[PDB]
């Protein structure tokens, strides 16, 4: 298991434009598109991404140039931030994976917001960052997603992806 395989169970792959979990126009594996209600307006971002009109519809080849793309700037947005960079340097490298995970979920602003569970992490305090990870809308949300993703920082094994 790795960070691509871990995110593409939790996003899924659809190849046609949909609602996520907010109800936001998304794309291939959870690729957002936009936050507006304007299926226009995503159609039109959905263009710009791929650098082709679409009408909506995408392959499977440009979904996973979209995933690589955001995994990608998930971690570069893990390394900029004063907050995060250092918790991400103290992880072992799959408990890494689950920190990438919510950032490709929530943004790099939603997570440095997790600043109690961040210091209990960066302290190896797993159960006791478990505990306080789960106290949040994320969890509440999308509680099976989250599970995994606590599972993953919990333990440093990928036992709750098998
Ligand atoms: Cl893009
Ligand atoms: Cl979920």
Redesign the pocket.
Known sequence: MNIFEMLRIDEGLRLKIYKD?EGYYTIGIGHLLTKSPSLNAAKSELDKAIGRNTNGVITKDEAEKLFNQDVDAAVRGILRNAKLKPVYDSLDAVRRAAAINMVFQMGETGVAGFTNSLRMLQQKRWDEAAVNLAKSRWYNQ?????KRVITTFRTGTWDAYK
Do not use: F, G, Y
């Not at 999308?142 to 989250?146: E, F, K, L, S």
């Open positions: 979990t999308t509680p099976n997603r989250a």
